[PDB]
Design a binder for this molecule. Structure first.
Ligand SMILES: NCCNC(=O)[C@H]1O[C@@H](n2cnc3c(N)ncnc32)[C@H](O)[C@@H]1O
Length: 221
């Protein structure tokens, strides 16, 4: 089963529109970077709504994970920020299509001609992660596929089957390899303050892995 790596069938290029959207997002929000977290939490909330809706009609929708939560983890020694939800998750096909492609023109023009509000409205808050990260990694497990990993440094992206297997049960983990100057988002206090402000209106429970020295999930909303 070497055909896949010898052919680079896991490597993809972004759609032109997306490259343009990413720059726009990064160019205008440079003064309001913290916004990225709200957008990831916002996306997490939407995925949780979806599985919840699916659970209404499909009895075995929550089989892979009964809880509906958003958990945030700061890994200082590894320079990573993790935002995990137990929502509907994404299939390999969706990882490629939903994150790699995309009133696109009206927005491309609207953005050019505070955009923190529009970005959310247009459903492209995902890319704001690149304001604070050199690499964004999406690990996701959907009910209809095996766990896969999507990764990108913004110049291309690849998707692979997670060799770790189904560790999520169901859901998605957004992993940010934070830029050297975005180290402050590794600080609990900072994260907690941001999460507490951007979670106040999320209907699902959001936690932050914090210390009191023992560690444990701490409810934020
Ligand atoms: N067009 C902007 C980029 N595309 C997305 O953000 C889409 O990817 C999917 N997505 C993003 N974050 C997600 C997440 N955390 N869980 C499940 N699906 C997610 C949704 O379809 C979302 O609209």
């Amino acid at each position: 089963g070497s055909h896949m790596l010898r052919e680079k069938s896991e490597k993809f290029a972004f759609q032109a529109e997306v490259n343009r959207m990413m720059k726009l997002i990064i160019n205008s929000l440079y003064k309001n970077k913290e916004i990225f977290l709200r957008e990831l939490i916002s996306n997490a909330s939407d995925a949780l709504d979806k599985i919840r809706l699916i659970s209404l009609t499909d009895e075995n929708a929550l089989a892979g994970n009964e809880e509906l939560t958003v958990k945030i983890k700061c890994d200082k020694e590894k320079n990573l920020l993790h935002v995990t939800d137990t929502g509907v998750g994404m299939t390999r096909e969706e990882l490629v299509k939903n994150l790699g492609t995309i009133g696109t023109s009206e927005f491309l023009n609207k953005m050019t001609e505070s955009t923190s509000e529009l970005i959310g409205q247009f459903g492209v808050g995902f890319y704001s992660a690149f304001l604070v990260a050199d690499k964004v990694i999406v690990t996701s497990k959907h009910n209809n596929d095996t766990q896969h990993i999507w990764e990108s440094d913004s110049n291309e992206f690849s998707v692979i089957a997670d060799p770790r297997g189904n560790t999520l049960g169901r859901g998605t983990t957004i992993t940010l390899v934070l830029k050297e100057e975005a180290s402050d988002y590794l600080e609990l206090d900072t994260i907690k303050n941001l999460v507490k402000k951007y979670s106040q209106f999320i209907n699902f429970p959001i936690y932050v892995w914090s210390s009191k020295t023992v560690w444990d999930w701490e409810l934020m909303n």
